Structures are given as structure tokens and as C-alpha cells.
């Protein structure tokens, strides 16, 4: 029942945030059917927002990462701030990184 | 001898939120 | 394209049949194994005394390795039989065997009857240095 995100709905959400601002999410789920506020706001902060950093990882990004993940035991909200990245991107990059060591109409 | 065996042990800012009285207040009424 | 699709489907059906078939075979094998074990046990059941006891112990061990209630009952029956028919070292050995059997695992009842006989003996005891 809980839905994934079509590009339709996603676009409507972006235009909505453009009109209504961030804080009025319950007005965003008015436009967007089949979804809730918490879902909307949740996605906008986690994924859709353009200010987020989705980019490749430099050789320094990885060093700094491994450094932190060793320094701070599992806290991926804090670390994410330290890296200025969304968290599950950071965890994704991290797990893939240790694996370097290896051996319509209604819409 | 009982005392030894234990592990351990042997100003005006101008602002409303960062004052001491305030942290007393919220430290109490919020439980 | 149509021909290829048709060919694939039959193969998938065959694979499903194979998946069913292997399992069935395994089951059959298991069944066979069970029957063999039962037969062996029956045959076994069907100094000399000591030897017999040893054999019994071995059988018990085997059973354990390989229902529990049934086994216990059998044990009890055996004990009863022994009693009807009716040294220290032998006793010790028996005890050891019993212990072994318990670890591997009616039994409670059996324990209680023997324990009860021991209790009667103690009560008889109950009923200075020498005594001590």
C-alpha cells in the first residue's frame, strides 16, 4: 500500500514546495493524492531537495568518511551533518566502500 | 576505611534564554 | 520469438517437476531408513547377564542417537524384567550407562520406582562410628 515515487507525483511535489514553502506540508499532500504529509516532508528532506549533495566521492571524501565512522560509533545523522550529505547515501557509500576490500491516466 | 573503597572522589550573562534562572525554570517545569 | 517462448515454458514445467521429484525421493529414502532402524531394534530385543546388560545399554544409546516416551516405557519394562530375574563395580557401570543415556536424551516413572526401592532401603536404614 505504501507507495514509491513516480516522476509525476515527484514533480507536483517540487512545484508545490515552490509555491507553498517547506513548512505547510499538509497543503502539499492536498495536491498530491495517495500520500501523507510526513511522507512528503520526509522525501523532500531526504531526496528531492536540490540543495542536497548527490555527487561522486573524492579520495578525500572517503578518507574523511572512514575516519568518522571509526571515530563516532554508529551515528549517521551526526556524521551526515559532518559530511553535509543525506544519511543513507553516506551509509550506502560506506558499505559499498568496505566492499572495496573483498575476497498513468489518473495521474 | 569504608570511604576509600569507592571508585571516585578521594556570573551575569545578559540574555533571557542563556541565563541561569531560565535553565532552572525549564529544568523544573518540564520534568 | 513465439517458438522460443514455447520452448522455455515446457522447460520451466519440467524444472518444477524435478523440484517436486527430488524431495519425494528424499522422503522415500528417509522412510526406508526408518523402517530399517525399527527392524534392527526389534531383532536386538528378541558374565552372560553382564553382556546382555551391555547390549541393552548399547541399544538404548543407539535409540537416543536416532518416541521418547516409548523408549522410557521400554526401559521401565526392561528394569522390571531384571527385577523379576533377581557387584559394586557392576552397579557403578550401570549408573554410568544410565547417566550417558540421560545426556543423549516413562523414564521419570522408572527413576521413581528405583528411587523408591532405594528410599525403602534408606527408611530401613533410618529405622555410632559403624552406623556413621
Amino acid at each position: 500500500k505504501g507507495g514509491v515515487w513516480t516522476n509525476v507525483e515527484d514533480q507536483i511535489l517540487k512545484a508545490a514546495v515552490q509555491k507553498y514553502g517547506t513548512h505547510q506540508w499538509s497543503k502539499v499532500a492536498s495536491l498530491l493524492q495517495k500520500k501523507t504529509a510526513r511522507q512528503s516532508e520526509l522525501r523532500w528532506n531526504e531526496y528531492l531537495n536540490p540543495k542536497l549533495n548527490f555527487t561522486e566521492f573524492s579520495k578525500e571524501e572517503d578518507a574523511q568518511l572512514l575516519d568518522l565512522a571509526r571515530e563516532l560509533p554508529n551515528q549517521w545523522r551526526t556524521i551526515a551533518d559532518m559530511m553535509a550529505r543525506p544519511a543513507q547515501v553516506c551509509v550506502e557509500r560506506y558499505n559499498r566502500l568496505l566492499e572495496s576490500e573483498d575476497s498513468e491516466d489518473e495521474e | 576505611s569504608w570511604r576509600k573503597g569507592t571508585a571516585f572522589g578521594r556570573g551575569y550573562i545578559n540574555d533571557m534564554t542563556k541565563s541561569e534562572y531560565h535553565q532552572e525554570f525549564l529544568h523544573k517545569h518540564v520534568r | 520469438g513465439s517458438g522460443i517462448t514455447t520452448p522455455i515454458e515446457t522447460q520451466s514445467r519440467p524444472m518444477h517437476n524435478a523440484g517436486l521429484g527430488m524431495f519425494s525421493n528424499t522422503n522415500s529414502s528417509n522412510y526406508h531408513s526408518e523402517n530399517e532402524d525399527y527392524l534392527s531394534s526389534e531383532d536386538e530385543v528378541v558374565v552372560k547377564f553382564n553382556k546382555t546388560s551391555t547390549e541393552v545399554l548399547g541399544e538404548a544409546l543407539l535409540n537416543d542417537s536416532g518416541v521418547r516416551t516409548l523408549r522410557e516405557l521400554r526401559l521401565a519394562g526392561v528394569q522390571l524384567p531384571e527385577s523379576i530375574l533377581k557387584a559394586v563395580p557392576k552397579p557403578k557401570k550401570d549408573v554410568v550407562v544410565e547417566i550417558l543415556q540421560e545426556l543423549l536424551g516413562s523414564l521419570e516413572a522408572i527413576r521413581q520406582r528405583t528411587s523408591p526401592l532405594e528410599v525403602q532401603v534408606k527408611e530401613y536404614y533410618g529405622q555410632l562410628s559403624e552406623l556413621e
Binding site: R77 | W2, L26, V30 | -
Partner: protein
């Protein structure tokens, strides 16, 4: 200006004087904003500043815990391998416990609708849901944000955390598992007790009995002195740090679950606009925040008591002691600390001091604290609920002992872990000069007088315990009980709740709410309430005010129109059904009742009988006191032990003749043995702390937080009251003389099922009556009915 208005209005509400309906709401809003600002400030300053504890102190701490966990030969809790024997059961428990929040709801929200829906699928496929659950335990270290809505108590404002359901399920299961395995491997020693086996007043009683039964304390023989310590640990969950938590959980648990728990606490917190990552402290709303919190508490207590004495209290790992036990009386006397218990934050320590040791402590304390003016007793606090005579007296030996003890224990704990202030603390000194020994646990305030120095032994009311010695069997002390001031104010505040909220919620709804607070208040304190005026008073206004609430519901304040029949009729009667504590005159003029038989018309009046007048009976007599129930519990459980041995030894099954008499007796309430679900319940352990932490994770309270009817059966029966109320006014035949029951034409009561207007009809021939003091007679339009004044619905 805004902040200052928030403070001012709050301290105006604490006194509880004419605050508007909205100002309470608004003020709550301003306080939650301010509180979150303080939180984010603390977290940022921790980033800039760095963690408070220091590496030294941390190393010492970790070392302490390791030394303990070896001393107890403890096995780190494994991860719950699949094919675990109890998996499906622990599932059933957790899922039920989430289900119950929904179950008592008339109407359900969509999010709630989702929460109830997810569980139901859950029942269908446990094995899969286990796969998903444990997969989360491994994979997922990043979680969804958490919402905060501060709920108001009308004095305190307390937080409430709300998590998302998927996370709630894994949190619940993991919680339940940790408590089961933990109690199974005997992690927590005896003296950490907001625990399972004992309800809090039973805890207090066992604490007193514990005090008396142990040797010598009441001996005034030479230099004997006593002190009582009640210390809140202060901020505790707010000072916990994760770098440490991960490691101290590594000791006790597999690194998987430890890392999980540690990560779960770092989550974005959202209230409206405000949002901040939680970088530092504990979030008390997580289902397993209980276990974490207690474990950490133990870590503090090992600092307080030291390794040795702690091993004394908890005894050997082979045979751990009970709550109050020891091996030898030597081990008791070998150390100054005799009783130590920590109930969540609160710490209670009992210190008995010989002249030598006591004078040594005050020597060192005074040695670093010169006090020439003897003014230590000015800032000294003590109980103001008890009267002056029986309060603690202020004398130099006493006071100086108190501040000495508090000084040393003050020192032991580092200011980084917790904060222990002299302000919050209470020290009670039992002295040759002080006959009383004061303390308070939960809401009970307890004055312990040893029968020795009472100078007189008087048979006293049921709000007073008798302390019975384990060996002598003589009664050596009376414990006087009163109701802590705080929970009096909580009661009063709740009544005010019903008042402010029930603007037009109907009489019936109000009555249930009024009863629940009352039943809860008496039952928890049953005995104590008798001795307190303000709880004792307050109520008289509270009922007379609500009655005066219904009286305005038509138009009147007038006595004459309404006879206590309206309010107190049981529901079957169609009376509101409200219970009573107060004084109320059933005027003998209103008992008159007339019936017709084909022979004639007969009348009945008991008014002419002049004796003690008829009064609506009240609770204080009706509710059973504590001491009788504990005694009955002891004898009953003894009897059940025996009969059970009869069934076993004779291989029979229990007759039931014995059982029936004691079936409702006993504090665990024998009936509980035979309930539908024991098979599951034995795998439910840590229920009591879960109940208490239901404060934080959900908005609507559960007014009875001290029992599970599952484990403890059902403690109190009130039906008797209902018959007494019926006969108190005359009885069923009499009661219905007040109603319309004869108008409906039904001949006998028994066949009436029932199903505001309906109310006023049912009682109409009273509410409308010709003995009204003032009113204006108006004949109805086409009928012969006369109306006195104007009654709206009639």
C-alpha cells in the same frame, strides 16, 4: 518580553488561580518552544565544547562495569538466532502491547488506522515478520524522525515521543527480548526496584518492614543516630553519551543490537517548524529506553556503593539474595550502609551511625566546611506535611550528620554523569533527640515511630501500619501514612481538567472521569487518604461543584427540586451513577412512596422514624485497606502452597472447595493462576517499568499505571457500594419512586436493557415538582401539565 510572559503565566498556573481556558494551551505552546531551544543549545555547545565526561572518568567507569560483570560471571546476551524457542511468543506479547493502545478507542485516526492495520497482517505471517525484523536489526542504522508533543499536567509539562510503526515493532520486540533474557540471566541485582514482582505500595511496605526487621536501628542505647536519604539523580537521561553507551552495551549485548540501540537515539526531532538532530542525550520514548535507563542506573549505583558492598547486597552469583536479605548479620553490620534502593531516579539510602563513625564523618565535613554560626540548619529542608511536633527537630548533631552524609555521597558521583543538588535532597535524621524517622516513596509519606518511644500505645485507625518483626513477632513500630502533596495537587488538577474540558460533554461522561480519578487515588493510597485534610477537603467542593454543574444544566441552584436520587442512581436506574465522598443529607421528606392495588392506595413514609438520619454512604469506609490484604495474601498463598502439594503428592486435582473462599484473596489474587494466557505471560518480564514509561511514548494516560490486571489479577471490587447506595435511599423499590419508571408502563425492573433529553424525561417528576421554592406556573399549550419556571428540555 515574550519569554517573561511565559514564565509569569506559568507560575500563575502552578498556584492555579483563574487562568483562562486558552491561556493554558498557549502557555504550554510557549513552554515547548522554549524547552526545545534549550535542548538545541545544549547539543550545539556539546559540539563546539566537546563531551563533558573526560577520558579519565570514562575509563574508570568502564573499568567499574567490567569488574562487576566479571564478579557476577555474566554472559553477554546473544543475538536472537532464528529457531529461537520463544520467538513467536515474544512476538505475540509485543504485538499485543502495541495493539492495546488502539483497542480502547471509540474512533480511530488514519495514522492509528495504519498502526492497527500493520499489526493485523503481522498476526498472519510471524515467520516473515521475524525475517524482516532481524534484517532491520542488522542493516538499518538510519531512522525516521520523531515527533514531540508536550502534554500538560497543569503544573509540569512533560514530553511525549511518537515513533513510526515499523520502527515501533522492532523496538518492541527487541525490548521484550532484552528484558526476558536479562531477567533470565539475572543481570539486575535486587535493590534496583521499580521492578516486576511488587506493586509500589507493597514496595514501600516491604521497605518499612525491611527497616524494622533488621537489627538494632531503634536502639537509642548510647550514641545511636539515623539518617534517611532521598535524592533525585537530577538530569540523567539528558546527560547520557553515545560513545560510552555503545561500549557499555558491548559488554552486556552483542555488538549488533548495541550498535542498533546506540544509533536509534540519534534521530531528527521535529516539533512543527523546530527540528534538530539529537546528538547527546537519551530519548525516553523508545520502547526499550527502559532497559537502557536501568542498566545505566546500575552503572551509577556501582559508583555509589563500591564493588564490595554491592556484592554484599546482591550476594553471590550462585544464590542471589532477595530484596532485603543478607547471609550473616555480620555482613550487615560490617558496613555503615544498611539499606540502599533506587527507584528510577530516586535514591534512598539508610545510614545508621555510631558515635565513633558519625562523629568521624562530621569531623571531616566540618573540617572542610567551617560553620561557626551553626547556620547549616537555615537552608536545610524537611517535611512540611507533618506537624511541628512530629516533624524532624533541628539539632546540631542531627543536621551536621545529615549534611555530612549528603556531602560524601555528593562527592562520590561525578558531576558529569549526573547532578546531585542539596536543594532537591531530603535528609531525615533519627536521633536519640529525634524519635521520628521520616521518608517518602512514591506518593506515600511515612513517619516511623518505634513503639518504644511513643510513650503510649493506642489502637488507631486503618491509615496506620504496624511494623511486625521477623523473629520476635512483637510489634515494634507504627508507620503513619499521608498522601504526598504533589499527588494531591495532581488530583485537584485533574478535577479541574474535567471542569475546563467538560463545557458541554454531558453529565454521564463527566461522572466516569470523576470516578476514575477517585478510585485511582484511593486505591493506590487506599489507607493513607484518611489522614489528609486537603485531599480530604478539596473533594467536598469538587462534588458540590459538579452537582452545581448539573443544576445549572437546567436552571437552578435549588435544593428542593433535586433529590440526591438523580446523581447517585446506578446506571440501570438511569441515575448518572456517580460515586460519593462527602456529606449529603437525604432529606427524609423525599423518601415518601405510594403504590396502588385494586384494594386501594397505600402510602409509605419512614420520615416519622426519628433516629440518625439517612446519609449517602462514602468511600472511606468502603475501600479495603492495605494491611488486611497483605496479611490475607500471606495466609492465602501459604494455604495454596499446601493444597498444591496435596494435589501433587496424591496425584489428584484440587477440589475447589478450598479455592473458592480464597479465590479473590491474596495480592497476586489467586484467580490469576488460572487465566486464559499464563503460557505466554511467563515470557513477559519487565512489565512494571514498561507501564511507567508509557508516560513518554503516548499521549493519553493510563490512570492505573501500577498494575497489570494480567499479572496482578483484579485488586479491588466496588459492587458492594452499589447495593449500599440503593438501600441508602430506600432500595430499588424506593429508588425508582423518583424516576419515570412507573410511567413507561413496565411492571418489573428486571427486563430493562436501556439502550440528555432521555435523562430529563426519566427524572422529570422530580425536576418538575410542586414543592419548588420559586417559579412561575405556566400551563402547557393544549394539556393540563403545569411547569414551574422553565426547564429547557422538559
Amino acid at each position: 518580553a515574550w519569554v517573561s510572559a511565559a514564565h509569569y503565566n506559568r507560575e500563575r498556573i502552578k498556584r492555579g488561580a483563574h487562568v483562562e481556558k486558552t491561556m493554558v494551551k498557549k502557555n504550554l505552546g510557549r513552554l515547548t518552544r522554549l524547552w526545545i531551544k534549550n535542548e538545541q543549545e545544549r547539543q550545539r555547545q556539546i559540539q563546539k565544547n566537546g563531551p563533558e565526561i573526560t577520558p579519565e572518568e570514562a575509563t574508570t567507569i568502564f573499568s567499574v562495569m567490567v569488574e562487576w560483570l566479571e564478579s557476577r560471571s555474566f554472559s553477554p546476551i546473544p543475538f536472537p538466532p532464528l529457531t529461537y524457542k520463544n520467538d513467536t511468543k515474544i512476538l505475540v506479547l509485543a504485538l499485543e502491547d502495541l495493539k492495546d493502545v488502539y483497542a480502547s478507542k471509540v474512533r480511530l485516526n488514519a495514522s492509528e488506522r495504519e498502526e492497527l492495520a500493520l499489526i493485523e497482517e503481522a498476526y498472519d505471517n510471524p515467520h516473515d515478520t521475524l525475517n524482516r525484523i532481524k534484517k532491520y536489526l542488522l542493516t538499518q542504522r538510519v531512522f525516521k524522525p520523531v515527533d514531540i508533543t508536550m502534554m500538560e499536567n497543569y503544573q509540569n509539562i512533560s514530553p511525549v515521543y511518537s515513533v513510526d510503526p515499523l520502527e515501533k515493532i522492532t523496538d518492541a520486540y527487541l525490548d521484550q527480548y532484552l528484558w526476558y533474557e536479562a531477567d533470565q540471566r539475572k543481570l539486575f541485582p535486587n535493590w534496583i526496584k521499580p521492578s516486576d514482582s511488587e506493586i509500589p505500595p507493597l514496595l514501600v511496605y516491604k521497605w518499612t518492614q525491611g527497616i524494622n526487621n533488621l537489627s538494632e536501628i531503634w536502639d537509642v542505647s548510647r550514641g545511636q543516630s539515623a539518617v534517611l536519604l532521598e535524592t533525585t539523580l537530577g538530569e540523567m537521561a539528558e546527560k547520557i553519551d553515545f560513545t560510552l553507551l555503545n561500549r557499555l552495551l558491548r559488554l552486556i549485548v552483542d555488538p549488533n543490537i548495541a550498535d542498533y540501540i546506540t544509533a536509534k537515539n540519534n534521530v531528527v526531532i521535529n516539533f512543527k517548524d523546530m527540528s534538530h538532530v539529537n546528538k547527546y542525550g537519551l530519548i525516553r520514548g523508545l520502547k526499550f529506553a527502559s532497559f537502557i535507563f536501568q542498566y545505566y542506573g546500575l552503572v551509577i549505583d556501582l559508583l555509589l556503593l563500591g564493588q564490595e558492598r554491592a556484592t554484599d547486597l546482591a550476594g553471590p552469583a550462585n544464590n542471589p539474595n532477595e530484596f532485603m536479605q543478607f547471609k550473616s548479620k555480620e555482613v550487615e553490620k560490617a558496613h555503615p550502609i544498611r539499606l540502599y534502593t533506587r527507584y528510577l531516579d530516586r535514591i534512598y539510602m539508610l545510614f545508621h551511625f555510631e558515635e565513633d563513625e558519625g562523629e568521624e564523618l562530621t569531623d571531616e565535613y566540618l573540617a572542610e566546611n567551617p560553620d561557626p554560626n551553626f547556620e547549616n540548619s537555615i537552608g536545610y529542608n524537611n517535611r512540611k506535611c507533618w506537624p511541628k511536633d512530629s516533624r524532624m527537630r533541628l539539632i546540631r548533631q542531627d543536621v551536621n550528620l545529615g549534611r555530612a552524609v549528603f556531602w560524601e555521597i555528593q562527592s562520590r558521583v561525578p558531576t558529569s554523569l549526573t547532578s546531585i543538588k542539596w536543594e532537591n535532597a531530603f535528609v531525615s535524621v533519627y536521633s536519640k533527640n529525634n524519635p521520628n524517622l521520616l521518608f517518602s516513596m512514591c506518593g506515600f509519606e511515612v513517619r516511623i515511630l518505634p513503639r518504644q518511644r511513643m510513650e503510649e500505645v493506642v489502637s488507631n485507625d486503618e491509615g496506620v501500619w504496624d511494623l511486625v518483626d521477623e523473629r520476635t513477632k512483637q510489634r515494634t513500630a507504627k508507620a503513619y501514612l499521608k498522601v504526598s502533596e504533589e499527588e494531591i495537587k495532581k488530583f485537584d488538577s485533574r478535577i479541574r481538567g474535567i471542569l475546563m474540558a467538560s463545557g458541554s460533554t454531558t453529565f454521564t461522561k463527566v461522572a466516569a472521569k470523576w470516578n476514575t480519578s477517585l478510585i485511582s487515588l484511593f486505591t493506590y493510597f487506599r489507607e493513607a487518604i484518611v489522614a489528609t485534610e486537603p485531599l480530604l477537603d478539596i473533594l467536598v467542593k469538587g462534588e458540590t461543584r459538579i452537582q452545581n454543574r448539573v443544576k445549572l444544566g437546567l436552571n437552578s441552584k435549588m435544593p428542593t427540586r433535586f433529590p440526591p436520587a438523580v446523581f447517585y442512581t446506578p446506571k440501570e436506574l438511569g441515575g448518572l451513577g456517580m460515586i460519593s465522598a462527602s456529606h449529603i443529607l437525604i432529606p427524609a421528606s423525599d423518601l415518601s412512596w405510594s403504590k396502588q392495588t385494586d384494594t386501594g392506595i397505600t402510602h409509605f413514609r419512614a420520615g416519622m422514624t426519628h433516629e440518625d438520619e439517612k446519609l449517602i454512604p462514602t468511600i472511606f469506609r468502603y475501600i479495603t485497606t492495605w494491611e488486611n490484604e497483605f496479611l490475607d495474601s500471606q495466609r492465602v498463598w501459604a494455604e495454596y502452597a499446601t493444597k498444591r502439594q496435596e494435589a501433587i503428592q496424591q496425584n489428584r486435582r484440587l477440589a475447589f472447595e478450598e479455592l473458592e473462599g480464597s479465590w479473590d484473596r491474596g495480592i497476586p489474587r489467586i484467580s490469576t493462576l488460572f487465566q486464559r494466557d499464563r503460557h505466554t505471560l511467563a515470557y513477559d518480564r519487565g512489565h512494571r517499568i514498561r507501564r511507567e514509561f508509557k508516560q513518554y511514548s503516548l499521549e493519553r494516560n493510563s490512570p492505573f499505571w501500577w498494575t497489570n490486571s494480567h499479572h496482578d489479577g483484579k485488586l479491588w471490587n466496588l459492587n458492594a457500594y452499589r447495593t449500599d447506595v440503593i438501600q441508602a435511599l430506600g432500595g430499588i423499590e424506593t429508588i425508582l419512586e423518583h424516576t419515570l419508571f412507573k410511567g413507561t408502563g413496565f411492571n418489573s425492573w428486571e427486563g430493562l436493557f436501556w439502550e440528555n433529553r432521555r435523562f430529563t424525561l426519566w427524572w422529570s417528576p422530580t425536576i418538575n415538582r410542586a414543592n419548588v421554592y420559586v417559579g412561575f406556573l405556566v400551563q402547557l399549550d393544549l394539556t393540563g401539565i403545569f411547569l414551574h419556571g422553565k426547564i429547557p428540555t422538559l
